[PDB]
Amino acid sequence: QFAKPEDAVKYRQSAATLMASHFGRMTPVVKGQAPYDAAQIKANVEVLKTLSALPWAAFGPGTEGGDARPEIWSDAASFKQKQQAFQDNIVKLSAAADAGDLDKLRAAFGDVGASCKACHDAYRKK
């Protein structure tokens, strides 16, 4: 869907911006600093679920650029494992939110965050 590689870079950076917001805005909830409203979190995690599927299609062939490492493309199966595993952790977060289980939400949230960082460590330029 991208006329030029720059359009794919802009897309995936904007998807990442929205994922950071929808994930990070839950930090105070998981820490107990903000109240836990199960319906509010359920809805927010449903938005995060949608968004967390979106970046990967914007690392298509010829879309090199931004702060994306070339090893994303040369190790295609390894980068795929990482994004699929990240979305597996999103599924776990969804299950916790849908159940209304806060303890499970805490745990799942931590696992999601670790998966974000693991990918950036390997595949995002400093």
Nearest CA among 13, 33, 23, 6 for reference residue 116 = 23
Q: Which stretch in 20-28, 74-82, 83-91, 107-115 sits in contact with its own copies by CB under 8 A?
A: 20-28
4, 6, 17, 99: residue in contact with its own copies (rule CB under 8 A): 17
Q: Interface with its own copies includes 50 (CB under 8 A)?
A: yes
CB half-sphere exposure, 94, CA atoms < 13 A: 13
Is 116 annotated to bind a ligand? Reply is: yes
Measure the CA–CA gap between 23 and 35, rounded to whole angstroms.
16
Q: Interface with ligand HEC includes 60 (CB under 6 A)?
A: no
Q: Interface with its own copies includes 116 (CB under 8 A)?
A: no
Is 75 annotated to bind a ligand? Reply is: no
Q: Interface with its own copies includes 13 (CB under 8 A)?
A: yes
Q: Interface with its own copies includes 11 (CB under 8 A)?
A: yes
CA distances to 18, 26, 87, 95 from 37, in Å: 21, 11, 24, 15
Annotated binding residues for heme c, written as ranges, equal 12-13, 67, 116, 119-120
